[PDB]
Design a protein around this ligand. Sequence first.
Ligand SMILES: NC(=O)c1ccc[n+]([C@@H]2O[C@H](COP(=O)([O-])OP(=O)(O)OC[C@H]3O[C@@H](n4cnc5c(N)ncnc54)[C@H](OP(=O)(O)O)[C@@H]3O)[C@@H](O)[C@H]2O)c1
Ligand SMILES: Nc1nc(=O)c2c([nH]1)NCC(CNc1ccc(C(=O)N[C@@H](CCC(=O)O)C(=O)O)cc1)=N2
Ligand SMILES: O=c1ccn([C@H]2C[C@H](O)[C@@H](COP(=O)(O)O)O2)c(=O)[nH]1
Ligand SMILES: O=c1ccn([C@H]2C[C@H](O)[C@@H](COP(=O)(O)O)O2)c(=O)[nH]1
Lengths: 543, 530
Amino acid sequence: MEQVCDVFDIYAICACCKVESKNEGKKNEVFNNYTFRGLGNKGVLPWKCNSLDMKYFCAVTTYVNESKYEKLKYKRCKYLNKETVKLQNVVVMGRTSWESIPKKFKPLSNRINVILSRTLKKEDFDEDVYIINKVEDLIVLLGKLNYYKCFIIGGSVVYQEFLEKKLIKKIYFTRINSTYECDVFFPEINENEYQIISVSDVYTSNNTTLDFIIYKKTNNDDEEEDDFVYFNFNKEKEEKNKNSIHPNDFQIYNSLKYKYHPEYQYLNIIYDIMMNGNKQSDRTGVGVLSKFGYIMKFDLSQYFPLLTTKKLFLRGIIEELLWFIRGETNGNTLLNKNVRIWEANGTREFLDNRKLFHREVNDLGPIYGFQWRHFGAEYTNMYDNYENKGVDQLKNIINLIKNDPTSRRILLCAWNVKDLDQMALPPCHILCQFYVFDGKLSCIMYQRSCDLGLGVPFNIASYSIFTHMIAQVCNLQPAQFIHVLGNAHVYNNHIDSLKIQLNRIPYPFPTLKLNPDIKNIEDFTISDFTIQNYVHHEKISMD
Amino acid sequence: MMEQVCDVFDIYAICACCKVEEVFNNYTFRGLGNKGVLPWKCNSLDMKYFCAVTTYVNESKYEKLKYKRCKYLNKKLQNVVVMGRTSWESIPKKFKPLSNRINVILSRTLKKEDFDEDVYIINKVEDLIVLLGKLNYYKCFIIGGSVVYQEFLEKKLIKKIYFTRINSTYECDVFFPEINENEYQIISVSDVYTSNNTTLDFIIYKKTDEEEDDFVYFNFNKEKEEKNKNSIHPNDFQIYNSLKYKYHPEYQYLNIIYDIMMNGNKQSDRTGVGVLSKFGYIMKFDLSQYFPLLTTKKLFLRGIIEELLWFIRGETNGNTLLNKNVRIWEANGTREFLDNRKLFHREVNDLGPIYGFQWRHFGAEYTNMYDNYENKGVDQLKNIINLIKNDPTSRRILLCAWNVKDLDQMALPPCHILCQFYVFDGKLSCIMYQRSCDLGLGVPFNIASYSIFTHMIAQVCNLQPAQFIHVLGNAHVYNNHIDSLKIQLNRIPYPFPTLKLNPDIKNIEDFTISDFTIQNYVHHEKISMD
Ligand SMILES: NC(=O)c1ccc[n+]([C@@H]2O[C@H](COP(=O)([O-])OP(=O)(O)OC[C@H]3O[C@@H](n4cnc5c(N)ncnc54)[C@H](OP(=O)(O)O)[C@@H]3O)[C@@H](O)[C@H]2O)c1
Ligand SMILES: Nc1nc(=O)c2c([nH]1)NCC(CNc1ccc(C(=O)N[C@@H](CCC(=O)O)C(=O)O)cc1)=N2
Ligand SMILES: O=c1ccn([C@H]2C[C@H](O)[C@@H](COP(=O)(O)O)O2)c(=O)[nH]1
Ligand SMILES: O=c1ccn([C@H]2C[C@H](O)[C@@H](COP(=O)(O)O)O2)c(=O)[nH]1
């Protein structure tokens, strides 16, 4: 049986930012969709203006397809039983919202402007600017008009008094990922009434990241299509797929239509290794599902790609980077700061199984740092002085970027074939290549071995931060970080956790902030790095 | 105004053509039959394609077609197949009549009484049309006989030709007619496949729901047309853009060219020519199905095979290649070139510690190209073969030419930085990372080289080759190549060739040039990238 919002095509469109608590978050803040609920402040927007949100609002509320109207006209008039009634959309708002708009571009261009109010009389306005007395009389006015879709463009009350009356088929919802002072807030959307079916790319505008999501009301030449089917004649269409994983499992992941959030590059790879991976044994003797050769790209000028579908920490991985940059190989330096990334690889037991019987505990051999600052020097022990020994690759790439930015030889390589056996383990992160165009730096990192569940989330972060570091000391803006995965594997003991993760919807990404005073690569310290607006799902223990 | 018959009754042709017992064109593939049977006897994948196409039906779409045909006449679902009598007689008895299809048979010498089978007999093309008028069916496929294909093409009764290119040569006595390019144009090209010891592909000649808004919304910030960079005209890629489906794996290469031309960044370069460049691509080629030698221009493999054998031997002496009339490394070994690299004490054509040396002796002190380096440095090639044999699930099977210490002593640094290998279920894949990529000239050869190398390693390790995966870093088109690449991007690829190795070679160091054969290379003409 047909419903009102379904017939008249009534949608809500809004934008919500984060709201400050006077109660400083003394415990770990808990995030959900309701985190983004701030609508207004003192009769205006909490962030004053956002030029990309404003472009999106206009674009959505004014777009019309005339060739799909008849079906809507036939739907509506037949619903009303009657036979008879430039195509434009209806925008419905409250009195305050209408007063909030500046007169210069009021009324709202190319739209049928309706205004809910009880002190407004039609006398003071016009015919094309409909005034309405109550919620009930909209449906009446929509029966007498030619319009494509009907958008409730807000007022806290208006949204409130439309959602509880179930008059909203979809909510077009912008997540503004920054905090402001707010006096009015969007209602709390009930997970049983609406659900997200799409998530956009992540964007930066007016000094904040944002994304656009779509809530959907829940249910509680032609013959160019055939040529397509012919080209698929050689597939294996079935019920059971390689690795015993079910339909139930990825319900929410598969229920989304559009998944353009860049976090899906990581999640889709996980999905693909789960659906199509090869069962293989491994060195650790745990078992993996693996595939070979993927690429991700992250636009560092729009966001910092810190995964939001679980909680990630960055002190440790920043310290590792600073340790690399110093050329250090001494695992004790990291352990004394309680960064234990390399602890297991520096034990007596581990070093002995590597046949490094004459190596001091936590002396990791000529690994990353040594290779970046001293490639080709003779490694002795972790306490020796190597000043001016070997090739200082880090310095060389920084000089190439500054003086010869179009070079195709700007590479930082860790995979020193001669020294491999002396390393506690060989590098997973083989090399970094750099590319500079128009004042912008991009970096490719080739990773030979990628633990999708535990390692890769951190690996993305390390090299994003490093790309910022290199860019800043060379007076460039960071553009793309490009992650190439060789042997890409999901450990079997991660499978259940990654199943939980794949059915979580990303939040818009945070931003990285470097102390702008730092201008040489060796001058960074742990307090020079700030992550802002990290909104994330709850922590997951992978193992 | 008024419809052609082929449109109203959806009359298509499906056929398969081999090469016939050198300049190549579409007419290269024209072998239809021999001694009343197929020139190749049998091809499983082609048969499967044939069955899939001629039996596939879309129930939802019929009522739209019923109206069309009923308006034109004023008025379980199956397709029709129409064949010549001789072709009917070549079908084995247990496959007559073709299952799940209405079978129609053209004949003058035989009549309904001469057939036991549920089939329509007609003695006139015109009668086929009358019959289609009376029947309920989805589409009508003319499945040939050469005599049948010819007359239907001449009468302009064919809306599309579904054409299989069987990329091998056989004895033939009957032939598909030469298609007129003025009347039919190719609109789609499939992936390339191997079946019954031949490659083949499938091409198509053509006669010359609420969510959809959400998609428009999420595209609200995409650019206009005119802002998308370079001086590139529509007319320049009209054939390239004419194609509906571009699934031939050569499009991985061609699409990258296209992308660099339309979206690339204008940059100066070490050479002074300047390029359009972009950063980070990936191509995948399935070596179990084809050898990915580009077909949209002519390439030779003798040189790059000799180069590869020279690498495997650990050589750094350019004279070895010049004596086999291979001049790939010539320019990088001249007095002048070595002087410009500050290598004043290097003998001419002594390329220094390049690829071969790093593969066999990484870390050894380089002296000159004549020295005996026995058991010095790390023999990486040997190690990766041992790892593949004895520890196939290792994630450390890498071969690296970027020896940071030695870079300055090389005539020039390597472009092919590394190879990583992967082993599953008896099958070997290879990723090669290329730091710098001359799309126009180098990339077609580099694809070939490493595909061959993957074959060689797979073989001496008793594996079958699987994927060559090519990763490009600085991917550039030289400006002096643009006009030649505009030409090539409008050529339609041909089914790829195959590569055969002497199967008696069991150690990587034992291959010689004659142990390599390229078969069935069909290609467009040579292009100077001038
Ligand atoms: N590679 C492929 O794709 C493919 C596809 C199909 C067939 N084939 C091969 O092609 C060969 C057979 O082809 P073909 O040209 O020799 O024979 P065909 O075209 O199958 O048959 C010719 C016969 O069909 C009947 N016919 C054709 N046009 C007619 C008309 N307008 N009116 C009445 N009858 C008509 C006549 O039969 P009567 O003599 O009884 O009058 C005529 O002799 C075989 O080798 C077969 O294997 C290859
Ligand atoms: N593309 C193409 N390939 C062909 O082999 C072919 C064609 N077109 N057009 C006409 C034709 C006529 N010759 C033949 C000979 C035998 C069968 C046959 O036995 N077909 C069965 C087997 C298919 C299967 O089991 O995969 C059929 O049901 O189609 C069909 C056509 N053969
Ligand atoms: O920064 C890191 C370090 C390690 N690994 C993973 C990949 C493999 O699971 C394992 C390294 O061991 P091998 O692949 O070298 O055996 O750790 C990462 O993903 N990222
Ligand atoms: O096998 C090769 C060797 C060279 N090049 C190209 C890429 C660059 O245009 C040039 C070397 O350039 P540099 O990056 O060294 O400047 O040669 C290839 O594409 N493939």
